[PDB]
Design a binder for this molecule. Structure first.
Ligand SMILES: [Ca+2]
Ligand SMILES: [Ca+2]
Length: 71
């Protein structure tokens, strides 16, 4: 029907400061349940700090493609 997300945490929109709640709970331990499927995209898990940026960069609105920018 319709799909638009990128490594969502609570399947709300995406994994960012918004889904930090679970993040903190995650970074701490792997107890909570999140769409770990496509959650991590830098072998970090979520947004250690390197991904966050881009995330908070694209998640700003670009949320749809995400300028991963390889390099
Ligand atoms: Ca979300
Ligand atoms: Ca990551």
């Amino acid at each position: 029907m319709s799909t638009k997300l990128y490594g969502d945490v609570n399947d709300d929109g995406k994994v960012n400061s918004t889904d930090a709640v679970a993040l903190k709970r995650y970074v701490l331990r792997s107890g909570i349940s999140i769409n770990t499927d496509n959650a991590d995209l830098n072998e970090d898990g979520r947004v250690n700090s390197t991904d966050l940026g881009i995330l908070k960069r694209y998640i700003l609105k670009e949320i749809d493609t995400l300028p991963y920018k390889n390099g």
